Design an enzyme around this catalytic site. Structure first.
Site, PDB file in Angstrom:
ATOM      1  N   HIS A 111       0.857  -1.171   0.000  1.00 44.27           N
ATOM      2  CA  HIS A 111       0.000   0.000   0.000  1.00 44.27           C
ATOM      3  C   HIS A 111       0.898   1.227   0.000  1.00 44.27           C
ATOM      4  O   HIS A 111       2.087   1.129   0.315  1.00 44.27           O
ATOM      5  CB  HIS A 111      -0.912   0.023   1.227  1.00 44.27           C
ATOM      6  CG  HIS A 111      -2.074  -0.921   1.153  1.00 44.27           C
ATOM      7  ND1 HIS A 111      -3.083  -0.794   0.221  1.00 44.27           N
ATOM      8  CD2 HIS A 111      -2.404  -1.986   1.922  1.00 44.27           C
ATOM      9  CE1 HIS A 111      -3.975  -1.749   0.410  1.00 44.27           C
ATOM     10  NE2 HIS A 111      -3.585  -2.487   1.435  1.00 44.27           N
ATOM     11  N   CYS A 150      -0.091   2.921  -4.413  1.00 46.99           N
ATOM     12  CA  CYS A 150      -0.785   4.168  -4.696  1.00 46.99           C
ATOM     13  C   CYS A 150       0.139   5.337  -4.428  1.00 46.99           C
ATOM     14  O   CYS A 150       1.135   5.216  -3.710  1.00 46.99           O
ATOM     15  CB  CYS A 150      -2.057   4.309  -3.854  1.00 46.99           C
ATOM     16  SG  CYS A 150      -3.466   3.322  -4.398  1.00 46.99           S
TER      17      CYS A 150
END
Lengths: 90, 140, 4
Positions: free
Chosen positions: B88, B130
């Site tokens: 992440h 991301c």
């Protein structure tokens, strides 16, 4: 004498500020493409040729499939950052 | 003369960081599909000639120690170094199992003045994460 | 499909 920040290369899966996408069943878009290109041309192309071809594949051959009308039919473009001072062949 | 010198005893080391599960406190969900990615990357980079090692669900401490330890290794007989980060993330930072660490903190170990044996050799970093929360709607 |  050469810069300490030289000879780095950053292959980001997406541009700054943006989401990165992943398929629970097949994997992340970026890694899928990256591996696909590296299997075929990993030893006969320069690294920027490879990553450019990865950029192209992610941009065209992927579209987000989602429940949410906010997250549906979305696209992705990876982001290559080069501080290399020479061409790279494997 | 315009390409990196590849005449070395080995291509180099490749570290794959595969973060799938995160502590509840991070509020980050399971990254289903990343196992498929890590092994695929494993097959590809060893094929290129890298001596690749995979680590799973690393803490921030673990990630920092991993790359730092790698940066203190002897890369005299290696042509380059590569690190793949699967996790992440948000702008400039990447999620470890127990929180976040800036990506520039992780890659700074391999700067020319901190890793002499990798000097004038390419340092490759592949990052699947991301970098914010904007969406690309695309167009035809 | 999920985001990262």
């Amino acid at each position: 004498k050469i810069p300490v920040e030289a000879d780095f290369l950053f292959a980001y899966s997406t541009v700054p500020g943006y989401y990165s996408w992943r398929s629970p069943g097949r994997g992340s878009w970026f890694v899928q493409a990256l591996c696909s290109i590296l299997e075929e041309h990993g030893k006969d192309l320069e690294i920027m040729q490879i990553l450019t071809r990865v950029n192209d594949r992610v941009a065209r051959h992927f579209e987000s499939q989602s429940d949410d009308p906010h997250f549906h039919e979305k696209k992705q473009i990876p982001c290559v950052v080069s501080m290399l001072t020479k061409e790279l062949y494997f | 003369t315009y390409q990196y010198n590849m005449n070395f005893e080995k291509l180099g080391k490749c570290i794959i960081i595969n973060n799938k599960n995160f502590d509840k406190v991070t509020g980050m969900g399971v990254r289903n599909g990343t196992d498929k990615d890590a092994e695929a990357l494993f097959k590809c980079f060893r094929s290129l000639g890298f001596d690749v090692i995979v680590y799973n669900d690393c803490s921030c401490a673990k990630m920092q120690d991993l790359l730092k330890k790698a940066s203190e290794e002897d890369h005299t007989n290696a042509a380059c170094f590569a690190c793949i980060l699967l996790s992440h993330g948000e702008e400039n930072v990447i999620y470890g199992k127990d929180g976040v660490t800036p990506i520039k903190d992780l890659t700074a170990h391999f700067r020319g003045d901190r890793c002499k044996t990798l000097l004038e050799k390419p340092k490759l970093f592949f990052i699947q994460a991301c970098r914010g929360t904007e969406l690309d709607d695309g167009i035809q | 499909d999920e985001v990262x």
